[PDB]
Amino acid sequence: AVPKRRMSRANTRSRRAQWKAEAPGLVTVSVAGQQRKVPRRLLKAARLGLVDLDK
Amino acid sequence: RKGILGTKLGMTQVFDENNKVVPVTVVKAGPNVVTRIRTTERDGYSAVQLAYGEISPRKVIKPVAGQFAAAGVNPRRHVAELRLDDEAAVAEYEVGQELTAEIFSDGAYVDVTGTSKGKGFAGTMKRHGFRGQGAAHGAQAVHRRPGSIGGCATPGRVFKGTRMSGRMGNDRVTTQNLKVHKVDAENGVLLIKGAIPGRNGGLVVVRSAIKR
């Protein structure tokens, strides 16, 4: 099964627009005289000190 | 034409008056409050809306809560209608009438509607009861496959309602007839003969059979 036609300039774009990224949607943590912000799944680990925000 | 919402409580077996085994699907139709009575003047049909199952007040949505507040009723899990024939049958319901499973009377027949078990994208063999191709004598990679789906240059297309492959179950279905073995008044359970659609603990609408 080979493509019979060259796909049009309109049709190639309209599919290609669906390929995106979403995310994160941050929340305001606090740590060590500073806020930063973080994803909500990591909100426990941020203040408890399993992750590092310098990276 | 009487009716009742309930749940599927799972199956057992119970022995007959004449010593046979009848397999019985246990449903518990709890105390249902009629909330709203649809009437032929305003709506253009006759129906009864039934409320079922205990829910916490804080879980209830404010649009939904105000409808139960209009009825004068504590809010419930599920709500649904019994469509009924003619105008005359809605004459004997009042909003806040709490009907129970005692009504059905031993040796009745029912419809017992309920949503089916989802089987989760089954193709061809499971879904439609096709035969596959042979397991041996040459057969290259076709052992459960649909085969042909159409003729040739005429018509030059597949017809609508061709039987292929897709998501199976969660259909509304119906059993039809299905004899009521025993109404238990205390506890609020009906022993109905044979299988009734759906998972254990799914919503189920038992009503008296139109064919009977």
């Binding site: 994803p39 799944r41 990591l42 426990k44 680990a45 408890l48 399993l50 992750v51 | -």
Partner: protein, 116 residues
């Protein structure tokens, strides 16, 4: 515990039982470990059902912990330290924390640790 519904992590049934043994025996040594989040969730009901054998003190239970784990320093300190510590607590000896995504594969990490 409950069997895995899906394909067995490791890519085999025999590898899964060896993997959960190596994850459990590491957890009771250090008291903390970091894995992929699916490996962390699979480890919880495995690890707690060794700690229940610990707190119930008998030779019978020393044999049945030794059917897994396979290490004498760990099965010692499982019964010496960890067992009589969680004699007080009824259940739930373990927690999970989220440690953000791994670099190469974007696999979501998780730390799994004793409650203390």
């Amino acid at each position: 515990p409950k069997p895995t519904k899906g394909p067995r992590l490791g890519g085999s049934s025999s590898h899964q039982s060896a993997l959960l043994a190596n994850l459990a025996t590491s957890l009771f040594e250090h008291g903390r470990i970091k894995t992929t989040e699916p490996k962390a969730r699979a480890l919880r009901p495995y690890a707690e059902k060794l700690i229940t054998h610990a707190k119930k003190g008998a030779l019978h239970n020393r044999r049945e912990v030794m059917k897994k784990i396979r290490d004498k320093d760990v099965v010692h300190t499982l019964f010496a330290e960890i067992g009589p510590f969680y004699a007080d607590r009824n259940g739930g000896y373990t927690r999970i924390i989220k440690v953000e995504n791994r670099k190469g594969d974007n696999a979501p990490m998780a730390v799994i640790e004793l409650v203390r």
